[PDB]
Structure formats: C-alpha cells, structure tokens
C-alpha cells in the first residue's frame, strides 16, 4: 500500500503521469472530456462487478446501497468511486478557472449534437494561453494516471 | 581568488579553480612555459636531518603527492628478520625483534638491491641485498660496586642494551663496498633492552630495504608535511590599547605595533599558527580577516637519519615522474 491507509497515492501518481507525459504541443482537454475519458476507462471495470443479493439474483437499482446487499467487491467499487472523485476534482478545478477568466466552464457536456471547438469569441493571445499555462490536462496524462 | 578564507565556524574556498570550464574565459590551460615561469622554490633552512622550504605557485594535488610519496613510497633500509640465540631477558622475543626493526639505520638505500620474494630462503639473501647486524650483550654483577649505590649503571655491567651495540658484520663484497661507510644506527642511544645479572642477548638481524606502505619502519622521514602560508589582512587601523590586545591573539613574533603611529601591523605571517583567536572578540570583527595562500606550501621534511631530506624530496619527485612515465609507456589492454 503506497498511501495513507489507501492502496495508491493519488497526488503523486497524478504528478508522475503529468510529468512523464508532458508535451507543450498537446492540446488540453475540456473538463467534460476529462470526465468522459475517466468514465470510458472506469466503466467496464465497475460494470462487471454486478451486485447479487443473498438469494443469488440481481439487485434492483432502487436498493443497491442497502446494508444486506454488501458484497466482497464493494471495496473495489469504493476505490473506483474515489478514483473518479479525484479526477472529477481536477476537472472541477479547471472549470473554476474557466469561470474566473470569463470563459465558459464545461463541467457538463454542452449538447449531444454540438460540435466544433466552442471557445472562439474569446481572444486567443490573452485568455486561452493563460488558462493553458495554469491548467493543461491532456488525454495522455489522464489515461496514464488511470 | 586563491586565498582560503578562515572564518569563525567554517573554512571557505578550499578547492583549486585553475582549469578551463571554470568560467567562460576558458583560461588556465596547461602551459609548461607558464608553470615554469610561475613556480618557485625557496629553502629557508637546510640541516643534516631537517629541511624547510616553500613551494610557490604549485597545485595542491602535486604537493600532496610529493608528501605521500615521501611518507610511504621512498625506500629505506630497516631490520626485517631476527634470528635469536639465547634471549634470556624479561622482554619477549617478539617485542625485542619489533624494537630492533624500528631502529633507523644509517645506510644509503641506493647501495642495495630489492629482495626477490619468490626465491627460497637458502638463496634469497645475498651480499647485495642484506645487511647483517649482530648483537651480543651479557650482563654480570659488578664485583666492586659501591655499597651505598642503587643506580643499575653502577651495580651491573651491561644492564642497558642500546642500539649502538648492533655491530655490523660485512658479508662478501660488502667488506669492500661498505668500507668507507660502515653500518651504524642513526640514533645510537636508542634503549633497546634492560638486563640483570644472569641474562644474555645474542642475535643476528637481516636488514633489507622496503617502502613505508608495507611497514612504518621503512619510512625514511620521521615527519614530512606542508602547511599553507598564513595571511592576515588588517582592513582598518587598530590603535592604542586594543592593538596590544590585538597582539595577544597571535604568537609573539607575528605582529607588532609601530612606534610612530602606534598602530598594529603584520610582521611575520609565517610564525602564525592559525588559532583564529582574534575572531572570538567582537571588537575585531570587520577589522581583520584571516586566510591561507592556497598555492604556497611550506614543506618541513625531517629525516629519520638514513639520508638527507633534500635527497628524500628529490627521490619523491623522481618517483612521481617515473610513475607517469611507466604509465605512458604501457600498452592499453582492452
């Protein structure tokens, strides 16, 4: 165990992944894209951990978190939740920065069909480069961290 | 700067900084003409057993190499094997052999040859590589000693076995080679043993030549060391009674007060053993600074008596040059 009563240290792993995948020519990710990449990686891992009741059949979604349906895999599930939360925190931080510089904070996906790089009315030489300097999370960085 | 600054709690600037790559100027390349112009030797004292001389504008590595080669690489002759006939003393045979091996012998090391170790003992020692010293002392009661005396020098005959009792026994051509320079100990008054009536010592010591690295008895120098030239800078004039106090922070001959201006000035920085006492007192802070010249070495080579200190230093320089030449002539095996 590499953490304080945790299997993995999230801060050092995130810093390691950011440093060893660093590239100034790599475009950063919007917060919803970071969340989507985290969900894409962590989906099948926590979906194969199906919850069965004591009888041996599937458990309804309304009562997944009840006490009598606690299985041996829950710790794993807990880990994944914490992992997602940590990544979400990073995305939230980026979103907050985008809300402090006058830009639009895309913590949630904008639309199902909306396309194109939607920052286009903000001046590129002033506010885009500043938020790129302060926070730049690439797909390679988050994939390496996961 | 080439001045090792001495502070109250630390020593600063102790490393040599004369090489290209220290700065963008890329100067201080190795030029043998510049080193020949800059290097200086000043002998201040030259006795038969001690030499004092300053090496100026030389690097620390070379002077330290000379010191190390003088201590542990210049060969000298000392007793190596001891054969005992009837040692009846209180002193054990091992102790007596060790003491006899520790005496310095006044033998020129260039008159001998290195002993081949892999040869057997029947033909290992010849007349070219072994000096034989015989000792034979028997102690008897003095028949006409004073009644009221208690000195063993008067109550007994040979109660004190000294190093001058080590007689030299020439073997073969050593009867002619060592005719004008007989083998005597360099310190004849070394007290080897003490006896009482009824005790006897008789032994033969085979003496070969070796280096100081193998054993400390083969080191030709009792001591051989250098020290950097001290340097005292008085940044502000020190007047009156404080100057007298400023005089008491140094050995007596180091600094003095001028009679006219009544201010202290450095008289002889060589006598200054660096005790940095003046750095204890707050009144002399920001008024005096101490240092040592990094490329100004004061060698003091004291011989053990076998041969002159200047010969020892010259042999050390020749040994370093021969090491470099031998490494240059060797082929590099992959």
């Amino acid at each position: 165990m590499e953490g304080n009563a945790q299997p993995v240290n999230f801060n050092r792993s995130w810093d390691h992944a950011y440093n060893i995948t660093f590239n100034n020519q790599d475009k950063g990710l919007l917060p919803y894209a970071i969340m989507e990449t985290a969900n894409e990686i962590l989906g099948p891992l926590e979906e194969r951990l199906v919850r069965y009741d004591n009888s041996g059949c599937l458990v309804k979604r309304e009562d997944l978190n009840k006490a009598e349906y606690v299985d041996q895999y829950d710790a794993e599930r807990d880990f994944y939740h914490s992992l997602r939360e940590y990544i979400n925190g990073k995305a939230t931080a980026l979103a907050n920065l985008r809300k402090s510089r006058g830009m639009l904070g895309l913590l949630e996906p904008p639309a199902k069909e909306l396309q194109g790089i939607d920052p286009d009315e903000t001046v590129p030489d002033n506010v885009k480069t500043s938020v790129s300097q302060l926070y730049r999370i690439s797909e390679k960085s988050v994939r390496k961290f996961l | 700067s080439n001045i090792v600054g001495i502070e109250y709690n630390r020593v600063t600037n102790t490393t040599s900084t004369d090489f290209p790559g220290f700065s963008k100027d890329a100067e201080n390349e190795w030029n043998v003409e510049k080193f020949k112009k800059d290097f200086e030797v000043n002998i201040s004292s030259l006795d038969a057993r001690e030499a004092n001389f300053d090496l100026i504008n030389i690097d620390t590595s070379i002077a330290n190499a000379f010191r190390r080669i003088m201590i542990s690489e210049v060969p000298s002759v000392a007793a190596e094997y001891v054969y005992f006939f009837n040692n009846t003393s209180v002193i054990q045979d091992e102790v007596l052999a060790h003491r006899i091996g520790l005496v310095p012998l006044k033998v020129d090391p260039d008159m001998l040859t290195w002993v081949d170790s892999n040869l057997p003992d029947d033909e290992k020692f010849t007349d070219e590589n072994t000096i034989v010293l015989s000792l034979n002392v028997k102690c008897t009661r003095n028949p006409d000693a004073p009644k009221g005396s208690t000195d063993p020098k008067e109550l007994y005959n040979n109660a004190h076995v000294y190093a001058r009792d080590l007689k030299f026994e020439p073997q073969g051509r050593q009867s002619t080679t060592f005719a004008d320079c007989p083998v005597v100990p360099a310190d004849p008054d070394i007290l080897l043993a003490k006896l009482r009536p009824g005790q006897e010592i008789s032994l033969k010591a085979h003496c070969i030549l070796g280096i100081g690295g193998d054993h400390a008895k083969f080191s030709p120098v009792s001591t051989a060391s250098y020290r950097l030239l001290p340097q005292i800078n008085i940044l502000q004039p020190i007047k009156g009674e404080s100057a007298r106090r400023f005089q008491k922070c140094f050995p007596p001959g180091v600094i003095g007060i001028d009679e006219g201006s009544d201010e202290a000035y450095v008289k002889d920085a060589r006598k200054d053993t660096v005790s940095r006492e003046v750095l204890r007192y707050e009144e002399f802070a920001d008024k005096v600074k101490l240092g040592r010249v990094r490329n100004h070495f004061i060698f003091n080579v004291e011989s053990a008596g076998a041969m002159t200190p200047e010969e020892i230093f010259f042999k050390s320089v020749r040994i370093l040059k021969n090491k470099a030449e031998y490494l240059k002539n060797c082929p590099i095996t992959q």
């Binding site: - | 090489f19 043998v32 030797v41 190390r68 320089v317 020749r318 490494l327 240059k328 060797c330 095996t333």
Partner: protein, 102 residues
Amino acid sequence: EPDREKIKLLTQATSEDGTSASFQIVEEDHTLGNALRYVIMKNPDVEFCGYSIPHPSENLLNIRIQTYGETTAVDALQKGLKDLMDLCDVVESKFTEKIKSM
C-alpha cells in the same frame, strides 16, 4: 616484455567512438589519481575526469575520462601523463638549482 596487466580499458563503460572511457590501473592510489585528475582537467577538450578506489582491499584505481568530440579519452590520458612528467621535470629543475644556489 611490456606490462600488459598494468593499465586496462574497461570495454563495458567506454563509448563506441572512444570519446568516453574508463581505465583500470593496478598498484596505484590517490597519489597518482589526484595528480592525473588535476592535470587532465586542464585539457580544454576534457569535460569529465575522475578517479576512484573501489575497495581498500584491492590495490586498484578506476579513472574515467569523458571528452568532447575533438579528441578521444586515450589521447587525453597520454597528454595528461606527458604533462605530469613535464610538471615533475620543472619542479625537479627548480629544486635542484635552488639547492646549488645556497
């Protein structure tokens, strides 16, 4: 007749072009390694010269010389040995003339 066992070139540490090398020298210690280090660092082409005694029980000395592309490490070592010889000759001459001066 030449001493093949005196100085060796450790193949596993040298470079392909001979710019960087490490030499193992038998029956030496700091008294020669330090002098060689000081002399070789005065070569304008040498950017790395350092000696080491790996164990006191072994009478051995490993010296590493890394240069730029102008000269190989073997040439730097030979130049350093020759230059140390010249330094010893100059010191010898000055000392032997100041003895006869007084």
